[PDB]
């Protein structure tokens, strides 16, 4: 009986196994666009994914992760609020059972159909495991997804989901270009926060893009065909695997843009 997104083990229950769930810098949060202040101090954001090397995609019962080779300085995130270099290790989504919900962060309380999370770790800490133990160990790029026109660069991901339907399944996923999942503009909000799943460590600088990418209903429907359960178990569809907005507390959300 571990955490999950069910009525008896959902986000509201996580604090029992992870006290930090009621911490001072938990994520996600609602982004109040009118209160977020433009920060002249923010340097230009740099997303260098030209040499990104994906290797595999796995259903881990919480989402599916496209994993990358981070043994070398290739796909990195720098600039903006960040100091130093952060290396891409994996990306995953959260999505709902309906187009009206699914994102973890909200904008003026608005919930998007889904949210993409590109996870990077601060290279100054040597590895991901050590980085998550640091307040500035991680830097996650958040991108909202809305339903409309299909996203060409996402179809490759959608097509392999059939092979990793259940928890524990993984498949080769080489040569995937994450640049195809980025919106046109890099304008962003940013604030200090946490992982949004156990162990919910407060080691994350969050960079959430203002501009959503559009995906087709067909593409999102395939996300909804995945299973939380393992092979040969009662089917529990993988939907609504998002954590709700948490108290902002003593934090300020800064904007990179007008
Ligand atoms: Zn996430």
| Distances in whole angstroms, Cα of residue 196 to Cα of each of 11, 99, 236, 240 | 9, 21, 21, 13
Task: Please answer whether residues 67 and 104 qualify as being in contact, where contact means their C-beta atoms are separated by less than 8 angstroms.
Answer: no
Query: What is the Å distance from ligand 1's center to 33 Cα?
Result: 21
Query: What is the Å distance from ligand 1's center to 188 Cα?
Result: 17
Query: What is the Å distance from ligand 1's center to 155 Cα?
Result: 20
Query: What is the Å distance from ligand 1's center to 146 Cα?
Result: 16
b/e 3-19 (16+ beta carbons within 10 angstroms → b):
bbbeeeeebebbeeebe
Structure tokens of 209?
């893009």
Structure method: X-ray
Residues 6+ apart with CB under 8 A from 236: 227, 228, 229
Query: What is the Å distance from ligand 1's center to 59 Cα?
Result: 13
Triad 2, 198, 138: Cα angle to 5°: 160
Residues 6+ apart with CB under 8 A from 55: 67, 68, 69, 172, 173, 174
Query: What is the Å distance from ligand 1's center to 29 Cα?
Result: 13
Query: What is the Å distance from ligand 1's center to 240 Cα?
Result: 12
Structure tokens of 24?
């001072």
Spatial distance between the Cα atoms of 135 and 129, rounded to a whole number of angstroms:
13
Task: Please answer whether residues 253 and 32 qualify as being in contact, where contact means their C-beta atoms are separated by less than 8 angstroms.
Answer: yes
Instruction: Quickly list H helices, the chain.
Output: 128-131, 155-160, 217-223
3-state class of 104 per DSSP? coil
Task: Please answer whether residues 190 and 256 qualify as being in contact, where contact means their C-beta atoms are separated by less than 8 angstroms.
Answer: yes
Spatial distance between the Cα atoms of 185 and 178, rounded to a whole number of angstroms:
15
Query: What is the Å distance from ligand 1's center to 117 Cα?
Result: 5
Spatial distance between the Cα atoms of 57 and 173, rounded to a whole number of angstroms:
6
**Among candidate residues 11, 76, 21, 87, the one with its CA nearest the CA of residue 49:** 76
Query: What is the Å distance from ligand 1's center to 196 Cα?
Result: 6
Query: What is the Å distance from ligand 1's center to 148 Cα?
Result: 22
Query: What is the Å distance from ligand 1's center to 175 Cα?
Result: 22
| Entry field: residues in the chain | 258
Residues 6+ apart with CB under 8 A from 233: 166
Exposed (0-12), middle (13-18) or buried (19+): which is 63, by Cβ within 10 Å? Answer: buried
| Distances in whole angstroms, Cα of residue 170 to Cα of each of 83, 139, 162, 173 | 34, 25, 11, 9
Strand pairing report for 138-147 and 213-215: parallel
1-258 in CATH: which number? 3.10.200.10
Beta strands in 70-178, from DSSP E residues, in sequence order: 76-79, 86-95, 106-107, 114-122, 138-147, 170-172
Query: What is the Å distance from ligand 1's center to 93 Cα?
Result: 6
How many helices, marked H, and strands, marked E, lie in the chain? 3, 15
Residues 6+ apart with CB under 8 A from 234: none
Query: What is the Å distance from ligand 1's center to 58 Cα?
Result: 14
Query: What is the Å distance from ligand 1's center to 152 Cα?
Result: 22
Exposed (0-12), middle (13-18) or buried (19+): which is 231, by Cβ within 10 Å? Answer: exposed
b/e 192-211 (16+ beta carbons within 10 angstroms → b):
bbbbbbeebbbbbbbbbbbe
Query: What is the Å distance from ligand 1's center to 200 Cα?
Result: 11
H or E element: which one contains 67? strand 64-68
């Amino acid at each position: 009986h571990h955490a999950g997104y069910g009525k008896h083990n959902g986000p509201e229950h996580w604090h029992k196994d992870f006290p930090i769930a009621k911490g001072e810098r938990q994520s996600p949060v609602d982004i109040d666009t009118h209160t977020a202040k433009y920060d002249p101090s923010l340097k230009p954001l740099s997303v260098s994914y030209d040499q990104a090397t994906s290797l595999r995609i796995l259903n881990n019962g919480w989402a599916f992760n496209v994993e990358f080779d981070d043994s070398q300085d290739k796909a990195v995130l720098k600039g903006g609020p960040l100091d130093g270099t952060y290396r891409l290790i994996q990306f995953h989504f959260h999505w709902g059972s309906l187009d009206g919900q699914g994102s973890e962060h909200t904008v003026d309380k608005k919930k998007y159909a889904a949210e993409l999370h590109l996870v990077h770790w601060n290279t100054k800490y040597g590895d991901f495991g050590k980085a998550v133990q640091q307040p500035d160990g991680l830097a996650v790029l958040g991108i909202f997804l809305k339903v409309g026109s299909a996203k060409p660069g996402l179809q490759k991901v959608v097509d392999v989901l059939d092979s990793i339907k259940t928890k524990g399944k993984s498949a080769d996923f080489t040569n995937f270009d994450p640049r195809g999942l980025l919106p046109e503009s890099l304008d962003y909000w940013t604030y200090p926060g946490s992982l949004t799943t156990p162990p919910l460590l407060e080691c994350v600088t969050w960079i959430v893009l203002k501009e959503p990418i559009s995906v087709s209903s067909e593409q999102v429907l395939k996300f909804r065909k995945l299973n939380f359960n393992g092979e040969g178990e009662p089917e529990e569809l993988m939907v609504d695997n998002w954590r709700p907005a948490q108290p902002l507390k003593n934090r300020q959300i800064k904007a990179s843009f007008k």
